[PDB]
């Protein structure tokens, strides 16, 4: 292939791609993503992987606004940020402890916009619906087998009956 | 006494034939392709055969057997054929009654089974023949029947369905045992919950997103479609199923009333109740099913237009199903390229197709109801009513039907001096129950689908046209024309001398041709059968063996007329 993308780099591995649908989610009565959103999605991120490593590694990290490093805004609000070293740009957190520590405070991120797991997709970190507990052992079994035990009994009784009475 | 047998007869007629059986032959031809011949074949052949078998049923006052024994000995197999028909529909009809009861028993649940499709596995998302098809269908079809993809791959007899058609039998045994007259209240009572049930569903029925579109499919006449005979086929022989004529049971009912009766008023009325009761429960289930079809188109184009947000990276709504046409030829005409990759991929949906291929089947209406249950804000009582209005009704038409099938037995003194009849009622229901075993089994629905469709579907055609021969020419339709005005003291109308001679056996016999020579330029007769793959209903041909079955069934109570004929010839020489 003769030529080059503008958009390829060796630490583009590292970037997280982040999927925003505000109007489905809410409707109307839907906020405008301005840039005083940006910064406190920023916020909760670093908030995010503060915790992250606090709750973990047992390493207390400072991070900050500026430590979450967003490129390539559309207006789907559909963009990739990347989290780097408290203040050394050089060292990015590489993906994966980035994604532990979006799979553990995600619910506090969906909460500080008003969104549900479907309205803000991190294309790479899939929520988890929960097991579907099982009743005790079965409703319609216990059901059928008290139907079917009267219904027996009425038809013992009305043999006997029957035959009883001739 | 009039009460007495009018509500007698449409208990009778009133079963699982019209809120079952209508809506889905609706939905396969057509909606309203269906409902024409359907109208146009109850002035012809329901009302004047309805009125001659209550005539002969008067006339003679005699049972089915010696009705046509009295008329002509040479006939009187039509008498023993009209009660196997009954045999083979009380080894069938009561699956369905099975059904519900199921359907019943997973009612009690706060997570309604047919309302949330199961996990796929990852605990993330659902399965994928639960999400192609409904919860709904998916219920339907793997947690009721687990139907097999093919006729010819069958399992074992599926334990549950099982104990649900022997706790039916149980059921309609203990009713055949407890009472035979009692029925004051339950006139009163089973006659007006159906109807009280079908308006609480026809209430929501008609607020759903949609309705009209069901209604809309369910009452244009496509003319297209309309040239089919197997639509007027089927309409003629549905006609003859919920009247419940051709099974001989009218006639024993017809036969306990009084000579001096109009007969005349009460077949009318109760042809045009059966009719009004038929169309009112397709009304409901059509308006359910359109809404089905609405929410399909919709989701579809919802789906289309995700798809095309997230890669074209448009706004949130700025895609909508207003403008999407448009903004397709805008995307389209940016860049070629990038649009060819998934062109394949778009899917195209209108609500045409989705009408006929939403959902299509012998479980139409359990499929329809659940939904529109899913729909309810306490979806646990109304489930339980509706089900117990269909149980009702399912068990009220196999007392009349085991009832017909039962009084030739206990009549005959060779067997009623060795066996009690309770003995005999239970040695029938004992028979029947182990017989119908086999649409319980793995690719059970498969042989109900055949059972369904020609056990006591072209019999009734073939036993209704002998006896309106023998009655008008054989017997002599002055005579008996003659006979009915002593009875009564007013004569037969022109108007039904007239259907009664040449028009309905003529229109039988014209549906017989059409018939017989639209299966021998097909030369290949196909069923339905699920794909839980693709999710849906694909045409699969008959294999060698299934063939066999669908003559037998028809071809032993059809031909034990001549034989009977043959018969009484030899002993005569
Ligand atoms: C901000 O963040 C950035 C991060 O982006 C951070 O920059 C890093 O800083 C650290 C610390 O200084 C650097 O680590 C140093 O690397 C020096 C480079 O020389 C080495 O380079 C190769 C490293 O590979 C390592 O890992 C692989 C895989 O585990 C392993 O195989 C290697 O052996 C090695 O451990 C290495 O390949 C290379 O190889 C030499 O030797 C081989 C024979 O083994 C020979 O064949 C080669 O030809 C070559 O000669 C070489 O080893 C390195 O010199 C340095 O090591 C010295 O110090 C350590 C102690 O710190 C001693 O243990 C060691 O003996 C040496 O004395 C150390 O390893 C890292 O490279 C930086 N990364 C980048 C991208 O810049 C900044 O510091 C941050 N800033 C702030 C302010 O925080
Ligand atoms: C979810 O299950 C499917 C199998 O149906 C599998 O292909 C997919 O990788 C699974 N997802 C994850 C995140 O493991
Ligand atoms: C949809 O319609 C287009 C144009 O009519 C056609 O080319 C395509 O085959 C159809 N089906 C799919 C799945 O795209
Ligand atoms: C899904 O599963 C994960 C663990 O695999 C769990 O933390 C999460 O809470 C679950 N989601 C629920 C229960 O809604
Ligand atoms: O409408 C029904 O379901 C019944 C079936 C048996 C004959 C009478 N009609
Ligand atoms: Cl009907």
């Known amino acids: 292939f003769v030529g080059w993308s503008t958009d390829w780099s060796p630490y583009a591995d590292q970037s997280i791609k982040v999927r925003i649908s505000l109007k489905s989610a809410l409707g109307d009565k839907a906020y405008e993503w301005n840039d005083n959103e940006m910064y406190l999605f920023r916020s909760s991120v670093a908030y995010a992987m503060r915790q992250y490593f606090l709750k973990v590694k047992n390493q207390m990290i400072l991070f900050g606004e500026e430590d979450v490093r967003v490129a390539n805004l559309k207006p789907r609000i559909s963009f990739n940020f990347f989290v780097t070293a408290p203040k050394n740009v050089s060292d990015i957190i590489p993906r994966t402890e980035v994604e532990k520590a979006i799979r553990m405070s995600r619910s506090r991120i969906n909460d500080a916009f008003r969104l549900n797991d479907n309205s803000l997709e991190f294309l790479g970190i899939q929520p988890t619906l929960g097991p579907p507990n099982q009743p005790p052992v079965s409703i319609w079994l216990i059901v059928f087998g008290v139907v079917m035990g009267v219904i027996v009994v009425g038809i013992v009784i009305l043999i006997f009956t029957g035959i009883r009475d001739r | 006494n009039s009460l007495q047998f009018v509500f007698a007869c449409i208990s009778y007629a009133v079963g699982l034939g019209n809120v079952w059986r209508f809506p889905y032959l609706c939905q396969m031809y057509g909606g309203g392709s269906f409902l024409v011949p359907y109208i146009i ?53 009561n699956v369905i009654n099975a059904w519900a009861f199921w359907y019943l028993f997973h009612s009690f649940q706060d997570p309604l089974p047919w309302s949330v499709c199961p996990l796929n596995g990852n605990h ?11 919860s709904t269908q998916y219920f339907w079809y793997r947690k009721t029947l687990n139907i097999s993809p093919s006729l010819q791959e069958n399992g074992g007899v ?51 997103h949609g309705a009209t579109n069901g209604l809309m499919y369910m009452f244009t006449p496509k003319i297209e479609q309309l040239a089919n005979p197997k639509a007027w086929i089927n309409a003629a022989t549905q006609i003859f199923f919920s009247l419940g004529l051709g099974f ?3 006639i024993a009912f017809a036969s306990y009333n009084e000579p001096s009766n109009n007969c005349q008023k009460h077949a009318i009325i109760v042809s045009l109740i059966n009719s009004f009761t038929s169309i009112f429960a397709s009304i409901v289930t059509f308006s359910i099913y359109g809404f089905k079809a609405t929410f399909n188109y919709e989701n579809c184009l919802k789906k289309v237009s995700l798809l095309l947000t997230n890669t074209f990276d448009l706004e949130d709504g700025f ?40 959902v299509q089947g012998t479980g139409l209406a359990f499929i329809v109801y659940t939904e529109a249950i899913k729909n309810m804000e306490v979806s646990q009582l109304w489930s339980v009513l509706y089900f117990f209005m269909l149980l009702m009704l399912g068990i009220g038409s196999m007392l009349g039907n085991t009832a017909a099938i039962l009084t030739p037995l206990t009549d005959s003194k060779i067997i009623s001096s060795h066996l009690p009849k309770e003995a005999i009622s239970g040695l029938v229901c004992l028979v029947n129950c182990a017989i119908g075993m086999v649409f319980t089994m793995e690719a059970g629905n498969y042989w109900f689908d055949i059972f369904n469709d020609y056990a006591a579907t072209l019999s009734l055609l073939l036993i209704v046209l002998v006896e309106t021969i023998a009655v008008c020419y054989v017997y002599g339709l002055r005579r008996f024309e003659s006979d009915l005005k002593a009875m009564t003291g007013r004569a037969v109308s022109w108007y039904w001398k007239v259907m009664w001679a040449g028009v309905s056996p003529l229109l039988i016999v014209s549906l017989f041709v059409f018939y017989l020579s639209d299966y021998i330029l097909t030369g290949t007769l196909k069923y339905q059968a699920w794909d839980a793959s693709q999710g849906q209903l694909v045409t699969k041909d008959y294999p060698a063996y299934a063939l066999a079955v669908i003559g037998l069934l028809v071809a032993s109570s059809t031909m034990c007329i001549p034989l009977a004929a043959l018969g009484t010839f030899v002993q005569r020489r």
């Open chain 2, 319 to 358: 895609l909508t199903a207003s403008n999407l046409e448009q903004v397709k030829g805008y995307l389209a005409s940016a860049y070629p390229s990038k649009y060819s990759e998934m062109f394949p991929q778009i899917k195209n949906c209108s609500l045409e197709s989705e009408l006929d291929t939403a």
């Open chain 2, 124 to 134: 993330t998302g659902y399965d994928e023949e639960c999400e192609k098809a409904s």
């Open chain 2, 158 to 208: 599926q334990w549950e369905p099982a104990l649900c058609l022997l706790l039916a039998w149980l059921v309609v045994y203990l009713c055949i045992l407890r009472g035979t007259e009692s029925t004051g209240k339950v006139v009163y009572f089973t006659a007006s919950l159906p109807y009280c049930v079908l308006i609480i569903y026809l209430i929501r029925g008609l607020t759903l």
């Open chain 2, 248 to 250: 001989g049971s009218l």
């Open chain 2, 41 to 93: 074949m109850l002035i012809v052949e329901g009302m004047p055969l309805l009125y001659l078998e209550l005539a002969v049923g008067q006339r003679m006052r005699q049972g089915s057997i010696g009705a046509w024994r009295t008329i002509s000995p040479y006939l009187s197999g039509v008498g023993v054929a009209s009660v196997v028909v009954s045999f083979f529909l009380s080894m069938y009809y």
